[PDB]
Amino acid sequence: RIKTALSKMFNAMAKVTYDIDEADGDVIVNTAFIDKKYLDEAFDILKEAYKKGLGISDRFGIVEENDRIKIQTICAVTLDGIFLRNSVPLIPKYGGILEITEDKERFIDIIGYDGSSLDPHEVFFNFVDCEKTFLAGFREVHRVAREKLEEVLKKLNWNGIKAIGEPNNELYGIGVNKDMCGVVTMGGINPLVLLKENEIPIELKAMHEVVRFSDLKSYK
Amino acid sequence: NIRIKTALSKMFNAMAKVTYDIDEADGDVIVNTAFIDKKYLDEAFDILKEAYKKGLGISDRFGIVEENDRIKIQTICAVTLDGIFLRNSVPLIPKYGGILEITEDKERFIDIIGYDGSSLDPHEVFFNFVDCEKTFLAGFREVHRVAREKLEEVLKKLNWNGIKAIGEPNNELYGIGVNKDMCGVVTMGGINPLVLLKENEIPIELKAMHEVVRFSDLKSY
Q1: Same structural domain for residues A101 and A117?
Q2: Which long-range contacts (C-beta less than 8 Å, at least 24 apart) are formed by A68-71?
């Protein structure tokens, strides 16, 4: 029996424990691995990546392992989880490639979570350069809940949401459902793209962990 | 205007072009188009014959045209099947494209992408991850319970390789769940024989273009 990405993400939401009032709790992170000889350069590129608005929140993880280096970046499913905790249902719809050139802002390729058994961002990882093209998710919120969403987001004070569209409106080329508002999140593994782009060879298995937000390091 | 078009809507539009009649055993079909250098014409025809003998690919027929400096290869898409079924009043809804594993004790899709939410051809992602011995490109369609008996009537009058399995109403088929009062239909990927070329050390330029071609202008195996 095949599990859809949507249902993997739903199960993942229930482990989210992040409280905005405390500014701490359990988050969902991507876990990537690199060789130990790239430790110094990776931290630098990661700091720069977070300064350039890549990834979700100001925090990421970088730990010493026996032979390799473990790097943790927060998944957008964490946002899905925080919002649910605050009575704001967000439905993840698509993952794909976001194009930002001087002229426009559009999704150029997408995969839907509902009917796929892959992480869309693992499929598009190598066709992204994090200068013109970025990994991104498309979420939907109900229009009445949209006000609460912006209030919760402001209190959250995290990098990660790129846009919130008007009810029933096309957003970055993607149409929305009846009485829904498009929410575009930045891809969590975007900072990892920049390591590849600076010749840091990334081995990414589809590994996700629940970690405490406090144990992650800020870019400041 | 920069609206994303889904794989599903590309397929509905393609169905309209299908003109194949079961009773006349001819009509317009939808093909993929692939390119190889003319050095490999001899070897490729033998592999293609073998692929179609092994029941891979859709139908018994394929295109093999002398181009200028290359050789154009044409294989029939599953969307032809969809088109053929709609013309016999059997609405077939394409759901997923993916990798079908046929192993020792398991018959399962191991990875899929949904047509209705994606702007990619799923077989374009999964082309490099199949060997055509244990793993195969495959499609998943849903047919309504009432149309099922009609579908099987049409299938046998068509007499084409392509349909791997038809499931029971409201039952999982090959690891994939099904909607309310529906039956799973597993089609084989039209570009499976193209995999065998690549696997037998033949370089192949796979193109995104699909052609509407007469069934008569293709060669039987």
Answers
A1: yes
A2: A68/A33, A68/A34, A68/A35, A68/A36, A69/A33, A69/A34, A69/A35, A69/A36, A69/A38, A69/A39, A69/A42, A70/A31, A70/A32, A70/A33, A71/A31, A71/A32, A71/A33, A71/A34, A71/A42, A71/A46, A71/A192
Q: What is the DSSP string of chain B?
A: --PPPPHHHHHHHHHHH---BTTTTB-EEEEEEEEEEGGGHHHHHHHHHHHHHTT-SSSSEEEEEE-SSEEEEEEE-HHHHHHHHHTTT--EEEEEEEEEEE-SS-EEEEEEEESTT-SS-HHHHHGGG--SSSEEEEEEEEEETTTHHHHHHHHHHHT-TTEEEE--TT--BTTB---TTEEEEEEEPTTHHHHHHHHTT---EEEEEEEEEEGGGSEE-
Do B146 and B63 belong together in one domain?
Answer: no
Nearest to B114 among A104, A112, A173 (CB): A112
Does A134 share its domain with A220? no
Same-domain pairing of A151 and A206: no
> Which chain B positions have a beta carbon within 8 Å of A97's beta carbon?
none
Are B48 and B152 within one domain?
no
| A94 contacts in chain B (CB < 8 Å) | 117
Residues A66 and A113 in one domain: no
CA distance B82 to B77: 9
| Chain B residues in contact with A118 (beta carbon < 8 A) | 111, 113
Shared-domain flag, residues A204 and A120: no
Minimum CA–CA partner of A116 in chain B: B113
Task: List CB contacts (< 8 A) between A106 and chain B.
Answer: 2
What residues in chain A have their Cβ under 8 A from chain B's Cβ atoms?
A: 1-2, 93-94, 96, 104, 106-118, 123, 170, 173-175
Shortest alpha-carbon distance between residue B112 and chain A (Å): 5
> Residue A66 is part of a domain; what is its CATH number?
3.30.70.1360
Residues A86 and A184 reside in one and the same domain: yes
Number of compact structural domains in chain B: 2
* A107 vs A100: CA distance, rounded Å: 9
What is the residue range of A119's domain? 76-188
